[PDB]
């Protein structure tokens with residue numbers, strides 16, 4: 001009855017032991033609370049300055065924070081959207097003007113698949129081993145108009161390394177295909193902080209990148225998706241963007257600027273340390289527990305997959321929910337073959353440690369019948 | 370090209386009277402809310418979002434007379450904007466509906482979002498929509514009838530008896546009735562209970578409410594997508610493909626601005642818009658060839674008609690004096706020449722830059 005992962009996440013939104021959706025719900029740091037305390041000042045600034053200047057500063061702060069020095073800073077090359085999913089809707093509807101089929105990494109967050117399919121695009125799954133380990137086949141590239149990679153991936157944390165991004169961008173250029181990247185989880189893993197725009201521009205392929213500020217910091221879902229596109233993209237992303245919105249709030253852009261600056265001043269290292277700590281408490285707690293394993297040993301992402309033998313993720317979810325703990329079954333990340341995820345749940349790590357600890361102790365007991 | 374692309378040219382300019390968003394100064398009661406934003410933040414971290422959301426919806430719907438709205442969780446879908454609501458609706462229509470009857474003129478992204486999602490449009494002129502039943506031929510040929518009320522740019526309000534009849538006609542033809550009520554807060558004639566009428570007629574229906582145009586909240590807002598239990602369209606599914614929900618801080622802000630409005634802010638807003646409308650009309654009163662096509666509009670946008678000049682020529686001349694209005698062609702999404710001789714002026718502005726802007730227009734029109 002839960003048609004997608006988001007509908008599983010609705011069930012958790014009002015519980016103290018929500019470890020389902022990937023949004024950041026941990027406490028603000030002291031430096032971040034100082035930003036919140038200055039919100040009336042940021043409001044006045046947002047009333048008094050031209051939005052283009054605030055937007056330019058927010059983009060500069062965020063892209064430079066994460067190593068993306070080559071981003072196109074000319075006004076209009078980075079489209080600020082209400083969310084990365086709104087960017088994805090724009091991209092999907094734009095793709096459907098001239099593309100029939102999209103090669104898409106599998107598993108990935110399911111609304112990428114569902115927005116693409118919903119706009120009439122046929123999807124070809126590319127498993128992670130194929131995507132990272134070998135060139136894509138000429139047969140595949142000639143049959144699709146776009147290759148879409150989430151990196152770091154959700155739910156696996158896998159990062160497309162620079163050499164492979166380069167080869168993929170070269171392949172797309174050679175075939176005329178759009179390379180599209182979703183880099184929502186970029187901030188969590190320094191392996192994703194090499195300059196992606198430099199690679200893409202040097203390869204000369206048609207490209208689109210959707211950045212997202214929404215997953216890094218606990219900003220009560222105040223965020224923007226940033227839809228960045230090559231000059232030759234050849235899709236009507238600018239026109240469809242303008243059908244949907246005039247722009248985002250200057251106050252949100254100012255918040256993104258301030259949170260990015262705090263992150264540059266040591267907040268980002270603290271975040272990495274915090275996620276590492278929370279991953280450690282989860283793995284320590286599901287220690288022995290016969291039948292339990294962690295499919296993504298090297299992930300640095302803010303979500304964590306847990307696998308179990310002889311139990312189903314939906315079953316674990318129901319036993320968990322009877323104790324008011326809400327996680328996420330993994331089936332629907334495997335948008336082309338949901339049974340691939342039948343024996344996994346996903347746990348959200350962007351949480352205060354104490355509620356996370358309590359939820360994982362509950363899972364330890366459950367997983368011990 | 371669309372109206373939004375004209376609006377981008379004005380966005381960083383002092384004499385922007387183009388887009389309809391609210392850009393006047395906060396009232397003192399509203400500035401008090403902004404001063405307490407750190408408290409609203411703490412509330413949003415601590416309380417379940419469902420409680421804040423229910424309170425925001427209750428405050429906003431009751432403020433505007435919509436007491437029969439479906440208050441069960443999940444019947445009102447909070448979206449980042451009304452245009453996001455409209456994208457969800459357009460996409461949800463496109464599998465089962467080929468043709469939509471749409472009020473003409475209206476704001477052009479309604480037409481562009483519908484067309485962009487594969488729907489063919491059939492214009493319905495305002496005098497026909499309000500003045501008489503729709504024909505059986507039209508209603509049997511369309512899967513949805515879409516009415517903006519109060520309309521943008523005309524301010525025209527669908528009266529209760531005509532809404533009732535339209536909903537009855539849509540029910541008897543199996544047609545979805547969709548309303549965009551984004552400008553509801555401005556005109557008390559739109560504060561009779563629309564949900565009572567829709568539920569009583571028993572057609573399949575969708576209403577898109579919008580908080581964005583009423584208050585100067587730096588574009589912090591929600592579109593509210595409300596639907597009948599039997600709508601038969603994938604609005605809930607496609608909504609969930611796009612978002613988990615809106616920020617609890619924005620919902621708390623809507624609740625507080627709605628409460629301020631219920632305490633007298635809404636009366637003050639109506640008096641403020643009436644004052645700015647009076648400024649425009651007094652300023653242009655005696656100019657040769659100018660008329661006001663919508664004398665009873667209470668909307669926050671104002672149409673100005675002039676003979677012997679195209680709204681495009683007038684826009685061009687204003688732009689040289691750094692004033693940005695809107696040519697009206699593109700609101701007439703089926704027949705753009707219908708709007709060749711009008712421009713639209715935004716009234717949700719501090720009175721001082723509005724007066725400065727209207728003074729340029731007066732002198733441009735007099736010379």
Ligand SMILES: Cc1ncc(COP(=O)(O)O)c(/C=N/[C@@H](CCCNC(=N)N)C(=O)O)c1O
Pocket residue numbers: 242243244245246373376387388389390450451452453476478517521549551552579581
């Ligand atoms: C009747 C009606 N229904 C919905 C909306 C969307 O409101 P939103 O912008 O989503 O908050 C509007 C917008 N009216 C403004 C701003 C247009 C901004 N451009 C795009 N949205 N593409 C205007 O008339 O200038 C409307 O009139």
